[PDB]
Amino acid sequence: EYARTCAQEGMVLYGWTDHSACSPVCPAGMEYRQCVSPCARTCQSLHINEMCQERCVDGCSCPEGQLLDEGLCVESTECPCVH
Amino acid sequence: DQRVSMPYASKGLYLETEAGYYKLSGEAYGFVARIDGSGNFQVLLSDRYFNKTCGLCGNFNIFAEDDFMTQEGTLTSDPYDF
Amino acid sequence: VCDATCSTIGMAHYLTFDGLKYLFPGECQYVLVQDYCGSNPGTFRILVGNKGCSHPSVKCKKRVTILVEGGEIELFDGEVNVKRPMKDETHFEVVESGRYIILLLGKALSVVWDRHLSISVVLKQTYQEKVCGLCGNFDGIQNNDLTSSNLQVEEDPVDFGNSWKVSSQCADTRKVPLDSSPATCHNNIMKQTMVD
Ligand SMILES: *[C@@H]1O[C@H](CO)[C@@H](O)[C@H](O)[C@H]1NC(C)=O
Ligand SMILES: [Ca+2]
Ligand SMILES: [Ca+2]
Structure with missing residues (x-):
């Protein structure tokens, strides 16, 4: 809690969970990042930008590649199609 | 009572997931709620209700001592009966 | 060839350039419409956003954000707002005349807004299949306006516009069962005649 409560005030902290030996729970493929953008570029997404000027929010998210596709992190190569 | 799927956006309330964590946004009504995986309610609320609201999360004023004003309106020292 | 015109007749209907009403x-x-489509520079990115507008009612106040010349001018709630002015101000123009907000942006682009819901963008002879979105491609062919963002024609428009949402994680709409009567006029044959 203390992490977020400071973060809300306008001053965020970084990497504190690295040595704390406690990470908040998240499903497979993701673990807790800090200050990920809400507009997670997913798999079946339109490539538009500079509308998501929202503030930055903490939470768990995929690795660098491994785009989101239906609640899991899957590699960008295997983005399916839909019909 | 009817279990609905997710996401869900009826009546101006977008019920979405963000960063693997569930969100309920009420921007028209000036709030954002969410939950994490462990279960930790959080409420981001707009300054429009400055000095207005009163509930279990206290009033949105500046002071942090007076925000136990009961459903009648009574500054109660106890954080429990409140 | 003349100047085509999108439209939003009511709350949830859409008329294409080539002319295709769909629900x-x-x-x-x-x-709604853009230029960044396939193999193009992508000058303008007219968008549209509605809220509480799956069922038409006194709700469904629209929001419109139009993205041209690196600017951010948008409108809703009666007035227009400049969030980011664009570079070439010379082409910019606003004509608040009568009931409308006539709004030019260039040589071959113009927007009209009834102050309430309607969005009637007007494009000139310039493009001729240089755009895509919910209004189709502006090619003259009238039965290829449902070419989804994944580059295939779809038969069912409710799946189409789902391909054109910006936030790829919000709630996509629901395939409604087809009938001649909306919710109120459903099993309300009396009212159904009076409305008719
Ligand atoms: C809160 O409202 C009360 C009653 O109107 C007023 O007396 C008081 O000055 C207000 N305080 C703040 C912080 O706005
Ligand atoms: Ca307080
Ligand atoms: Ca066409």
Whole structure:
């Protein structure tokens, strides 16, 4: 809690969970990042930008590649199609 | 009572997931709620209700001592009966 | 060839350039029309966003964000707002005349807004299949306006506009069962005649 409560005030902290030996729970493929953008570029997404000027929010998210596709992190190569 | 799927956006309330964590946004009504995986309610609320609201999360004023004003309106020292 | 015209007749209907009325109740933000389509520079990115507008009512106040010349001018709630002025101000123009907000942006682009819901963008002879979105491609061919963002024609428009939402994680709309009577006029044959 203390992490977020400071973060809300306008001053965020970084990497504190690295040595704390406690990470908040998240499903497979993701673990807790800090200050990920809400507009997670997913798999079946339109490539538009500079509308998501929202503030930055903490939470768990995929690795660098491994785009989101239906609640899991899957590699960008295997983005399916839909019909 | 009817279990609905997710996401869900009826009546101006977008019920979405963000960063693997569930969100309920009420921007028209000036709030954002969410939950994490462990279960930790959080409420981001707009300054429009400055000095207005009163509930279990206290009033949105500046002071942090007076925000136990009961459903009648009574500054109660106890954080429990409140 | 003349100057075509999108439209939003009512809350959830859409008329294409080539002329194709179709039904699409949405609640997310959607790409009405743009230029960034396939193999193009992508000058303008007119968007539209509705809220509480799957069922038409006194609700469904629209929001419109139009993205041209690196600017951010948008409108809703009666007035227009400049969030980011664009570079070439010379082409910019606003004509608040009568009931409308006539709004030019260039040599071959113009927007009209009834102050209430309607969005009637007007494009000139310039493009001729240089755009895509919910209004189709502006090619003259009238039965290829449902070419989804994944580059295939779809038969069912409710799946189409789902392909054109911006936030790819919001709630996509629901395939409604087809009938001649909306919710109120459903099993309300009396009212159904009076409305008729
Ligand atoms: C809160 O409202 C009360 C009653 O109107 C007023 O007396 C008081 O000055 C207000 N305080 C703040 C912080 O706005
Ligand atoms: Ca307080
Ligand atoms: Ca066409």
